[PDB]
Amino acid sequence: MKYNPRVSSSRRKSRKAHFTAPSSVRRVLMSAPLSSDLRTKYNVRSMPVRKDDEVQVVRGTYKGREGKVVQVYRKKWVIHIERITREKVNGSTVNVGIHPSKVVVTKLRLDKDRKSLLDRKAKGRA
Amino acid sequence: RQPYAVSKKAGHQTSAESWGTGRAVSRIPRVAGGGTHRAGQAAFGNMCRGGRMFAPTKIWRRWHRKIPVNQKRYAVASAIAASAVPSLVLARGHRIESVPELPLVVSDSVESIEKTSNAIKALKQIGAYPDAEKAKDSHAIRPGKGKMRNRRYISRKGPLIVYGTEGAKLVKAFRNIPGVEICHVDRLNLLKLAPGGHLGRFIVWTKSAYEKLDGIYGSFDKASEKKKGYVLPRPKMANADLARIINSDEVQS
RNA sequence: AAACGACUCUCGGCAACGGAUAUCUCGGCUCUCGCAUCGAUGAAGAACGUAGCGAAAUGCGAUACUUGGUGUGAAUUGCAGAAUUCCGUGAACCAUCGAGUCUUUGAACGCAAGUUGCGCCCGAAGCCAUUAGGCCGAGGGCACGUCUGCCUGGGCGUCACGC
RNA sequence: GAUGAGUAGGAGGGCGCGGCGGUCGCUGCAAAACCUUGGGCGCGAGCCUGGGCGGAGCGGCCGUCGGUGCAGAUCUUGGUGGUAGUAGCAAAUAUUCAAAUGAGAACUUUGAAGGCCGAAGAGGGGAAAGGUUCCAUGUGAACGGCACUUGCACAUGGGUUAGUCGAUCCUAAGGGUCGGGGGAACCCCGACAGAUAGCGCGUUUCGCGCGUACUCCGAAAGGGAAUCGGGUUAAAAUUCCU
RNA sequence: UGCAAAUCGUUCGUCUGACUUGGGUAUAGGGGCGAAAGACUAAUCGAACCGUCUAGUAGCUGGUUCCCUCCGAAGUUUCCC
RNA sequence: CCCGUCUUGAAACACGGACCAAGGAGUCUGACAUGUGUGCGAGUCAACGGGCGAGUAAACCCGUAAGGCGUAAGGAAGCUGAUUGGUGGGAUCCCCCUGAGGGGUGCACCGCCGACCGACCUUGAUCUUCUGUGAAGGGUUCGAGUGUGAGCAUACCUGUCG
RNA sequence: GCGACCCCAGGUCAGGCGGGACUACCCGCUGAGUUUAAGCAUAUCAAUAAGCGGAGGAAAAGAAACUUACAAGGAUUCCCCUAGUAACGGCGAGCGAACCGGGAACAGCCCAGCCUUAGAAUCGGGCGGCUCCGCCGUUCGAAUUGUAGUCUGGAGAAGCGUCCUCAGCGGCGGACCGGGCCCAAGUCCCCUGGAAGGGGGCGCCAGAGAGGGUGAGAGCCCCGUUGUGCCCGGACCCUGUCGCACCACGAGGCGCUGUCUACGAGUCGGGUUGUUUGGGAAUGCAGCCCAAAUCGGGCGGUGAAUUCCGUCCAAGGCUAAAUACGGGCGAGAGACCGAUAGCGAACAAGUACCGCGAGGGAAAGAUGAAAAGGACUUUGAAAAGAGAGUCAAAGAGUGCUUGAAAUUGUCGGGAGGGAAGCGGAUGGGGGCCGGCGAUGCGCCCCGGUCGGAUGUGGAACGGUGACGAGCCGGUCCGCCGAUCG
Ligand SMILES: [K+]
Ligand SMILES: [K+]
Ligand SMILES: [K+]
Ligand SMILES: [K+]
Ligand SMILES: [K+]
Ligand SMILES: [K+]
Ligand SMILES: [K+]
Ligand SMILES: [K+]
Ligand SMILES: [K+]
Ligand SMILES: [K+]
Ligand SMILES: [K+]
Ligand SMILES: [K+]
Ligand SMILES: [K+]
Ligand SMILES: [K+]
Ligand SMILES: [K+]
Ligand SMILES: [K+]
Ligand SMILES: [K+]
Ligand SMILES: [K+]
Ligand SMILES: [K+]
Ligand SMILES: [K+]
Ligand SMILES: [K+]
Ligand SMILES: [K+]
Ligand SMILES: [K+]
Ligand SMILES: [K+]
Ligand SMILES: [K+]
Ligand SMILES: [Mg+2]
Ligand SMILES: [Mg+2]
Ligand SMILES: [Mg+2]
Ligand SMILES: [Mg+2]
Ligand SMILES: [Mg+2]
Ligand SMILES: [Mg+2]
Ligand SMILES: [Mg+2]
Ligand SMILES: [Mg+2]
Ligand SMILES: [Mg+2]
Ligand SMILES: [Mg+2]
Ligand SMILES: [Mg+2]
Ligand SMILES: [Mg+2]
Ligand SMILES: [Mg+2]
Ligand SMILES: [Mg+2]
């Protein structure tokens, strides 16, 4: 049960906040869980999805497909993966949007900030 | 309740005037001007599109009620008495087939439970878990417009736990279990004792609260310590067993 | 010979016309709570501009859908192009604010106004001109009523000293 | 056992809609809603159900609440008929022939013929008013009350060049004001209750002499400094070129 | 149910003046303006137009939404601008 | 005979109605009143406020000589302030006898007549601060009074009124 | 002619101040009528709407020239009650306070005047310094037609005693506020589905089962939610502690006094007129006329005279809190509305559009999970049609969830001498209905399975009684007989 007086349980307000979120907030909202191996290694559960991250889809028609993320379309709330595509009536190839909550991160692109965030997340879990 | 009412100015934000008779149209006031779809249309009428409703709702409606304290106490005592009748508790929808006895009074050690898992284990031990499981399984989305009015989920009522020690940690341990409600013995609420106005709430008493009941509600002979001058009401019938009276030796002779 | 057909009407399937019904909702209405912050240091409002590709809405002011600091940490995206030591003074139609820019107006202030109309003053730099002045002009000034102080003045208004 | 009429009107018991507190359920093995010469229950309000469609929710029961039940109000908003392929297309004398283009020509363009406006015009320019309608190219739909290949429509581009033409300057009827006088105040009168703006001469920039309380707005027809030929564009010219 | 919320055809009055007309300017609602018709004052005039008081008041006109069941009238008395 | 309406009288040569969908009109509030349900009862009402408390607009608790209504009325007012009944019917119950009987009991309600309080009138021993008191005795007068309380809170329909 | 002062004039002189904007609340002015009175004029509407001004975060009011008559209360404000009362009113319609009493909050103060005269001890500006919201030095100016200091009626001045009280700085914390970072649990097995988030099974977290998103009802997929921990910044105010100097000249506190004791004028008050109020021989306010006093003045709800009594001290000023709040910025909620509803506006809505103008003012939301937004063939001038393709679905094809009625076309059935429709009764034709309409039961023979006492033991249990004894009793299990059902 919510107790903080500065947070609202209103459905309308929560929906408005989610659908008007700026890019910086959308990045956090577009988080995905880490794989079992990565979760065990880093002691972290979920991370924001990045461009060059390796991802395995776990839901939908592409449940077995995996690859490298190639675009994070925050405006559309979807990511794009290397070979997860389809053919139009024209015959050309287009990427299929996949929601990050429905995929699993198998390999992270590590930098100084990424390592700092991983350490910060692991510290709280202890 | 919180008051509701339409805007007092709604349907009157226009300078519309009636055309009068002689134009082969109704006498309802009509919007002035021209060059727009609104010009010439009716206004101010409860039967008019975009008009004011009949008898617009106002905030100074009598929302609240002032029931005499004695009647409130009567109702609370009646609900408490009904909670001790297993037939009534069953009739109210509670699964009490496994409870050792009614009223269900448990050891005061339950008041020191801190974790929800331990609370669940205690509920299983005392035989009240099936009611909580029934309450959890009934979780569903409320039908109708209420689901978009911030009342999205409804479910059945589980056991009500009454404790006698202020600041007991069981309140935190039990509050996350669906259907389970907790209340202090000194501030019992009729709304929880008779949900929906129906008697026979399933209640779990701690020993301390059960002991305090006598000092709170007194008795027929002496008065209550916590309710100044209050005495429990007496029924119009001393013995409600009608068969014992109708089939007695005195009557049947 | 009032049969077949046409017309009218009627009943049913299908197809039209129209947008009712049901299910929704980043909107409204109502109640409650917290705070006190516009303006001559030029407000509110009004005009005109500004994007690679925009008319409106939103934003902004010739530094013009943004400059700068800080936070966050890899986008924006309808299309095209360009960045980014992407293990980094570092992407973002991201967030937030301390630095900065902020056109014509408007209480609107040199005079006006159906006029980008009509005046006066100061002056950086530059041209040749030399203890002399000229051309040009960046840029800035010139409303009203008042308070304090000041400068310059008027009147036998009240006096005094001399002639 | 007896008995049965009912407008105005009163009351009782019930049916139906949407919420709230409870309770019992249904639903992607298909909810709501809607459709149906399928079937049944009730005197009735209504209710239950087959089949279809629809594709995400809904219902029963006990209490309780309400913006809760339509055939009418020349009722409101929206939608749709008969009228009806009907009334109408008729003022301003008038068109015809051949060719070109085009899928399509009575209506576009070229040529020829026959007519009209007849200089107080159906010609050639301006003022106000409009604001791109101006010019070139192209054109699906709409519009141009028949039609269009077309155009004052639509789409993409282009176009308005001044020392001499105007505004700008002056003042007209009048307008707006300082001070003063009124006014609770918004405001009223308007040079009328007043130390006016300033203007000339010589200069150590100071002196001398004049100085009747508005040096403001108000005319693209009143007054008024100055341009003419010749040529030039798809569209500008006393403005561009000489 | 017009080309037109005053127009069209023929006819008609006056036509150097109390003539006709453009622009500027002044007079604004119980006010203006009127060679005077209660005329005109933006298709509005015996008191314009716009917003508000305003959901103005009406003993008067019109409507007033489900079912069955039971009971079931009055147009007469007195008083009242 | 076409519905709705006004009407003594409508199928009317009486008005509205071309057709369909959706919307569309005795409500909310304040003061009273009868009725009914509920609590308590010579009382009743904690929600002005306070203590708290579902981490909480609820619920719970709190009336000191608080306050409202009731518990006493009659007079313009000064002011005074209920001596507590009788009787005819009458429900229920108890006795004797089985008659439409007799005796006892006599609530509710109704009829009749006293008594008490007060306005008014009348009356006057004794005391008394000299204007008060009140032994006795009253009245075709008047009251929304007394004669062993019946109210207060709250819910709803109906009715008058803003 | 010079000089001093006074009044005034000009300065683009040096440095400051003001105008205007917003509306929910707040302060001042001005000010109706509709309406009610069943007419209407006083009254009511209303000390309201409209109009003209002025502030803040609140405003305004505020420290008795009060309330009362008591055994007395004690600034202002607000709530309950007083009370629909006293009063007012063609005493009609109607209107209508205050004190006491109970609560919320509480807070008191500053001036003018006689009182330096051994010297204006006061203040502003320039300039120069400093630990710079200020202090110091110097110089000009203001001011004696009076700046400082003391005093304000509760007092106070002066005098004498008492020895009672009074003097900052800096550090570290707490309190308040605003922010930042991390931290629980499944996406395991099977099925239906385009997609599980649905059904079934097996697990887990919970001081987190508020809420939202993601391809359908998701506690454990994601954001969040609960509870800790850590980090940053304001407010210099309140509060605890610590380190150092802590000076009583002077000023206050208390007691005494054969002394003084200064207090607001065209103001109060009165007459009259107008307005307003419940204020009634006149409640307040305002114009005009008269016009005070200091052993006095105002009030004491009936005008006047006389004698007492009670209570305060006007005509100068400041002041937080309790209270108000349809505007501004920022939050939380709802038995509210759900696109003809709800604000006029869910959308480039105060927009398009209309009016010379003041002003008036709409309509308009829904493809799909994902554009995967329909390639290509063919006919056509083209719009498009016929095939084909995408999708779970086009029976979802960009005004794209669903798609009622009025109304219309087509096909099929039927009827029709100047309406049609309708009530009741049959009939013809059609349509529909198999709970539309049964096939069991009893007695015997054969075969197959399952069990068979009133006997004897065990397990648990019940009726009654007294949730004791005693009596009675059923279910299940194992055995010897019985040989039945
Ligand atoms: K048909
Ligand atoms: K920035
Ligand atoms: K000019
Ligand atoms: K239910
Ligand atoms: K059906
Ligand atoms: K209900
Ligand atoms: K062509
Ligand atoms: K003046
Ligand atoms: K003047
Ligand atoms: K001119
Ligand atoms: K030339
Ligand atoms: K008028
Ligand atoms: K009448
Ligand atoms: K009628
Ligand atoms: K008719
Ligand atoms: K009482
Ligand atoms: K009397
Ligand atoms: K000085
Ligand atoms: K002084
Ligand atoms: K004094
Ligand atoms: K005084
Ligand atoms: K006076
Ligand atoms: K006195
Ligand atoms: K609307
Ligand atoms: K569909
Ligand atoms: Mg709908
Ligand atoms: Mg409603
Ligand atoms: Mg001529
Ligand atoms: Mg052209
Ligand atoms: Mg002046
Ligand atoms: Mg001039
Ligand atoms: Mg009392
Ligand atoms: Mg104040
Ligand atoms: Mg009372
Ligand atoms: Mg008080
Ligand atoms: Mg100084
Ligand atoms: Mg679905
Ligand atoms: Mg999580
Ligand atoms: Mg139809």
Tab-separated table of C-alpha atoms (C1' of nucleotides) in Angstrom, chain D residues 11 66 68-81, chain F residues 3-4 16-25 28 156-158:
chain	number	residue	atom	x	y	z
D	11	A	C1'	-52.271	3.979	-1.934
D	66	G	C1'	-29.553	8.360	-7.883
D	68	U	C1'	-33.330	6.150	-13.128
D	69	G	C1'	-38.151	4.589	-17.552
D	70	C	C1'	-41.052	9.225	-23.340
D	71	A	C1'	-45.143	9.413	-28.666
D	72	G	C1'	-46.269	14.209	-28.241
D	73	A	C1'	-44.120	19.946	-25.384
D	74	U	C1'	-45.112	24.918	-33.386
D	75	C	C1'	-39.937	20.379	-27.591
D	76	U	C1'	-33.396	19.989	-28.511
D	77	U	C1'	-29.372	18.127	-31.737
D	78	G	C1'	-28.373	14.945	-35.594
D	79	G	C1'	-30.065	11.951	-39.523
D	80	U	C1'	-33.814	10.623	-43.435
D	81	G	C1'	-38.393	10.521	-46.742
F	3	C	C1'	-53.754	9.747	-31.229
F	4	G	C1'	-52.420	13.716	-27.209
F	16	G	C1'	-49.703	19.753	-31.836
F	17	G	C1'	-48.056	15.745	-34.554
F	18	A	C1'	-43.822	14.254	-42.291
F	19	C	C1'	-40.409	10.120	-40.345
F	20	C	C1'	-36.234	7.827	-37.034
F	21	A	C1'	-32.158	7.847	-33.206
F	22	A	C1'	-30.216	10.109	-28.743
F	23	G	C1'	-31.350	13.932	-24.959
F	24	G	C1'	-35.955	15.709	-22.336
F	25	A	C1'	-39.462	17.867	-17.114
F	28	C	C1'	-31.772	19.695	-3.780
F	156	C	C1'	-38.220	8.006	5.127
F	157	C	C1'	-42.928	9.159	2.439
F	158	U	C1'	-46.511	12.844	2.240
